[PDB]
Design a protein around this nucleic acid. Sequence first.
RNA 1: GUGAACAGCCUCUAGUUGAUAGAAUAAUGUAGAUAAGGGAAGUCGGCAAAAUAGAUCCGUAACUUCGGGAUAAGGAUUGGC
RNA 2: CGUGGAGGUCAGUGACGAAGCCUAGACCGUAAGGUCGGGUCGAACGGCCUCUAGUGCAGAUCUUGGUGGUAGUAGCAAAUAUUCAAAUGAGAACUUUGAAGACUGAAGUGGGGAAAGGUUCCACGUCAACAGCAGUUGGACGUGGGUUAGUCGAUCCUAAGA
RNA 3: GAAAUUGUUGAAAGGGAAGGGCAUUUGAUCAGACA
Lengths: 63, 183, 386, 109
Amino acid sequence: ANLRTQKRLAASVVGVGKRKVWLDPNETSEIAQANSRNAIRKLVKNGTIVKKAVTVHSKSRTR
Amino acid sequence: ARYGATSTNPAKSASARGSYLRVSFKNTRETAQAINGWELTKAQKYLEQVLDHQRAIPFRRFNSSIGRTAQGKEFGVTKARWPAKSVKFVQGLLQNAAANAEAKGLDATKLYVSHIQVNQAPKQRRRTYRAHGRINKYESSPSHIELVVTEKEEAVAKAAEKKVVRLTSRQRGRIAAQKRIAA
Amino acid sequence: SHRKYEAPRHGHLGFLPRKRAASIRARVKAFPKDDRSKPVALTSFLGYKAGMTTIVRDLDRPGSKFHKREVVEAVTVVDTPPVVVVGVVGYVETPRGLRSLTTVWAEHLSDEVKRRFYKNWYKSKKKAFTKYSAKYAQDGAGIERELARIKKYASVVRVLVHTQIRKTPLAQKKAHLAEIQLNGGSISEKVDWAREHFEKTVAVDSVFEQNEMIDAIAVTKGHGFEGVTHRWGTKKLPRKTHRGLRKVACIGAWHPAHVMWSVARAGQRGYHSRTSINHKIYRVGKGDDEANGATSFDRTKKTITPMGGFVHYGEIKNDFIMVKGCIPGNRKRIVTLRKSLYTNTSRKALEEVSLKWIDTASKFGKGRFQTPAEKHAFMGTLKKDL
Amino acid sequence: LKDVVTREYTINLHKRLHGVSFKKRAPRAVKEIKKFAKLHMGTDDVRLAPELNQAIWKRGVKGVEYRLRLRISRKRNEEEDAKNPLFSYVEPVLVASAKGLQTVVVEED
RNA sequence: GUGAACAGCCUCUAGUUGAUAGAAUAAUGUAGAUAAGGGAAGUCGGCAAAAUAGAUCCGUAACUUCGGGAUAAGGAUUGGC
RNA sequence: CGUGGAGGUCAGUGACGAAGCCUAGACCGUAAGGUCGGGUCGAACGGCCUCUAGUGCAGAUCUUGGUGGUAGUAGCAAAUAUUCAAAUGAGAACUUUGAAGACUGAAGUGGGGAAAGGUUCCACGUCAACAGCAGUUGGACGUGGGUUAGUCGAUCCUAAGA
RNA sequence: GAAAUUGUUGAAAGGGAAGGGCAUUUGAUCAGACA
Ligand SMILES: [Mg+2]
Ligand SMILES: [Mg+2]
Ligand SMILES: [Mg+2]
Ligand SMILES: [Mg+2]
Ligand SMILES: [Mg+2]
Ligand SMILES: [Mg+2]
Ligand SMILES: [Mg+2]
Ligand SMILES: [Mg+2]
Ligand SMILES: [Mg+2]
Ligand SMILES: [Mg+2]
Ligand SMILES: [Mg+2]
Ligand SMILES: [Mg+2]
Ligand SMILES: [Mg+2]
Ligand SMILES: [Mg+2]
Ligand SMILES: [Mg+2]
Ligand SMILES: [Mg+2]
Ligand SMILES: [Mg+2]
Ligand SMILES: [Mg+2]
Ligand SMILES: [Mg+2]
Ligand SMILES: [Mg+2]
Ligand SMILES: [Mg+2]
Ligand SMILES: [Mg+2]
Ligand SMILES: [Mg+2]
Ligand SMILES: [Mg+2]
Ligand SMILES: [Mg+2]
Ligand SMILES: [Mg+2]
Ligand SMILES: [Mg+2]
Ligand SMILES: [Mg+2]
Ligand SMILES: [Mg+2]
Ligand SMILES: [Mg+2]
Ligand SMILES: [Mg+2]
Ligand SMILES: [Mg+2]
Ligand SMILES: [Mg+2]
Ligand SMILES: [Mg+2]
Ligand SMILES: [Mg+2]
Ligand SMILES: [Mg+2]
Ligand SMILES: [Mg+2]
Ligand SMILES: [Mg+2]
Ligand SMILES: [Mg+2]
Ligand SMILES: [Mg+2]
Ligand SMILES: [Mg+2]
Ligand SMILES: [Mg+2]
Ligand SMILES: [Mg+2]
Ligand SMILES: [Mg+2]
Ligand SMILES: [Mg+2]
Ligand SMILES: [Mg+2]
Ligand SMILES: [Mg+2]
Ligand SMILES: [Mg+2]
Ligand SMILES: [Mg+2]
Ligand SMILES: [Mg+2]
Ligand SMILES: [Mg+2]
Ligand SMILES: [Mg+2]
Ligand SMILES: [Mg+2]
Ligand SMILES: [Mg+2]
Ligand SMILES: [Mg+2]
Ligand SMILES: [Mg+2]
Ligand SMILES: [Mg+2]
Ligand SMILES: [Mg+2]
Ligand SMILES: [Mg+2]
Ligand SMILES: [Mg+2]
Ligand SMILES: [Mg+2]
Ligand SMILES: [Mg+2]
Ligand SMILES: [Mg+2]
Ligand SMILES: [Mg+2]
Ligand SMILES: [Mg+2]
Ligand SMILES: [Mg+2]
Ligand SMILES: [Mg+2]
Ligand SMILES: [Mg+2]
Ligand SMILES: [Mg+2]
Ligand SMILES: [Mg+2]
């Protein structure tokens, strides 16, 4: 398997860098089928691809 | 076919080869000689070990500035190595030879490796870049491997000439009297 | 052309070749000259280098600015449990040199020696000396004739002793066997002594005594493959020099067109056999003795084992030889201590020391305390303790 | 035979990593453990829980803790039959302090 | 963010984690450091290396085209709350 | 003495094996060389008299091609760094995914363009060569798909100049 | 389907090169001639 394309596509659809799309290992067969943006799209919204939160750079110690 | 010189009984033998193999010709030479003549089953167990770095292959010709290792005391040599890619090609052939003897109906228990010869396949040119804008050859030196397995067999019995004894008048005369005299 | 300036060479050619020794047990190449009037005894001993400490003592050198003053001096300690006698070997004179003609062995033989005759003790059937031992059976016949033969011929007698390595902190288990010449009177009395001592045991204090000058024979510590600068004490080359500087610049003139035996080259360093002479015995320690490290002037009961124990060695529970200064070999290595080959009058030898205080402070750091007693004394009570 | 056991050991990584080049410490730790595992279970097959992995790398390459308290579990191999029927699994145990525990056996159920 | 700062050093977003690999750590190296007492005696030559350094305040010679020389030289001070 | 070609001749040898090549087998010659046997081979070839010349190699730092010892040797060490597990696959240090440890630190290892390249873009398939280890991966290989303008550029203008 | 150069098998020799000349021992191999 090879979710290279689905990763990039995931990044683009969600509007976020590839360093933040998460493709869950348990639904790898389902994911690799997803060849289009429309199929990545419902994969995102049913929790198979999630958007992975930002890394915090808190201003607290600054303040 | 037409292998190199064999002396074995083809009726009792089986064989295999691989040509144009891309393995080191020098390395696999040494490992082929390492096994030459062996009980086929001892050979298999032996190359296996080699891959565990448990016993080694004694390097005997192609070997200057090789390292030394206690694993060659076995064979009286100090330089010995563990040439993986050679072993694995060579056991490939050995396993194929095995099959064919199964297929021929030879006894798998009497099987020793009776011919094992490697020589040099056509080379493979690739190039590399040297200082001041020069090129140099950078070659693969690949191998043909061929081996033959035979069922061992005991004895040989006798049978030969008879020695046509010729001895002159005074030479057959002594003998006549060597019994006319004695026993 | 000619050196331009003269300087002595670098290193001594009486120590070539500078290769690793044939064995960890350096060899006695020489025994003391035999005076057959004296009683029979050994002329060397076997021990293990334990380590070093400090000593304080009044010096007695009339003439010296330190006459009747204290000095502090360094000392080594070799762990020295009794050696055990297991065989006699009789040599004879031939125009080809000395040759052994028999070796008579004791009936029983400690495992520690039986150890030595092997490379794989555990797997082995341990048959070493099992037929030989049967020679005793019958009356005595066989061994008498041998003993007898030694007596008849034999220009020198040596004793086969071995060490009691199990009485020693080491892990080694496999003891050390060696020959020791016998210089008490008369070839015959010698073998009688040897025979009398089979399986029996010999003590240090019957070979060495206080203030004796003795020699140390041992294999020098090892350093493996060495550069020319540290191996020969050659000059460092200047910092500007291409392709490195711990070297020698000229390895030789153009003629002889050969590198010569006499120039420094890289190579092995250490693990050489050495024979040090003139090490004075400052103490002959007894193992069954507290107050080992105590003195006439100290008093305070304590052994010579430093707080926390000899670094890298262990404890010392057996007799020891305390020799002034240092010694070829390193901690844990077998050392042979030999009797002197000449009777030094020196003054320096002859001086009869008697220690005043023996350092016993820990050697694992900047030791501050001689004894736990002293440490509790000074420190007071701690969060562990009572 | 085989034996299938689980124990919980503590391993002194500190003296094992003593000397090791900073950029190699966490990776030695991984390997070192593996070795530690084989030495106790006899077993050439040694798998490390991705949590034990986290535990090891918890403080960057060169900041391995001095002592870890692992849980070594010798299990039987399944599928495609490897050379040996047995392997080991290593897990981080959830202890406050890896200091001062003796080596114990986890009872099996 | 620190700081005079588009400096250096750490971070967010994004992007990478590509550079044959394993085991050892001999000599000699390449690159990075330290060294008692002395302090250029080394050397063609102080080559290399070390020392100095920011800021605030005090203090500043010859000579000069009066513009400089000048951060001359030489000093003190500096965190946290 | 030997070679390529020519006139004559032996009504010469030959697919029942010409020529060539191999052979510490035989024989003739002082020698250049000649002759034969055996093996290999497959379509042509030789003796004698004469004619003829691009006619004989060990060398020329000779020409072209092929091959060695060197040698499994020098080496594959700049750019801080990797790790655990799963999945896949004949095969996984190197592919994919998840986890972790880091890096570039916006004067970027980010996001785009100009010149130049020209399909490298993208999908699917895929490992013989190629990516100085590997390879299931690729800017490689096979097969396809993809570049939409009244407003963006060109096109018009003029500059040095032609 | 030569040669350089290589693998294997068989035979032999090898105390700091090898190869060469005259001569013979020993091994291997062979022609001719007898009648
Ligand atoms: Mg072929
Ligand atoms: Mg060679
Ligand atoms: Mg060779
Ligand atoms: Mg080597
Ligand atoms: Mg080398
Ligand atoms: Mg060599
Ligand atoms: Mg050898
Ligand atoms: Mg290059
Ligand atoms: Mg160039
Ligand atoms: Mg007679
Ligand atoms: Mg002179
Ligand atoms: Mg030796
Ligand atoms: Mg005898
Ligand atoms: Mg050194
Ligand atoms: Mg010196
Ligand atoms: Mg010294
Ligand atoms: Mg020098
Ligand atoms: Mg230079
Ligand atoms: Mg260190
Ligand atoms: Mg990029
Ligand atoms: Mg590189
Ligand atoms: Mg200094
Ligand atoms: Mg000074
Ligand atoms: Mg000077
Ligand atoms: Mg001065
Ligand atoms: Mg000078
Ligand atoms: Mg000058
Ligand atoms: Mg000068
Ligand atoms: Mg400078
Ligand atoms: Mg300083
Ligand atoms: Mg001036
Ligand atoms: Mg000035
Ligand atoms: Mg203040
Ligand atoms: Mg002619
Ligand atoms: Mg002609
Ligand atoms: Mg012509
Ligand atoms: Mg020939
Ligand atoms: Mg003939
Ligand atoms: Mg023929
Ligand atoms: Mg023919
Ligand atoms: Mg034809
Ligand atoms: Mg003519
Ligand atoms: Mg010509
Ligand atoms: Mg010529
Ligand atoms: Mg030629
Ligand atoms: Mg030539
Ligand atoms: Mg010539
Ligand atoms: Mg030529
Ligand atoms: Mg190779
Ligand atoms: Mg190499
Ligand atoms: Mg390099
Ligand atoms: Mg390396
Ligand atoms: Mg790098
Ligand atoms: Mg990698
Ligand atoms: Mg950073
Ligand atoms: Mg910057
Ligand atoms: Mg890059
Ligand atoms: Mg672009
Ligand atoms: Mg291009
Ligand atoms: Mg692409
Ligand atoms: Mg391939
Ligand atoms: Mg490429
Ligand atoms: Mg490659
Ligand atoms: Mg490959
Ligand atoms: Mg394509
Ligand atoms: Mg296309
Ligand atoms: Mg417009
Ligand atoms: Mg237009
Ligand atoms: Mg052909
Ligand atoms: Mg001859």
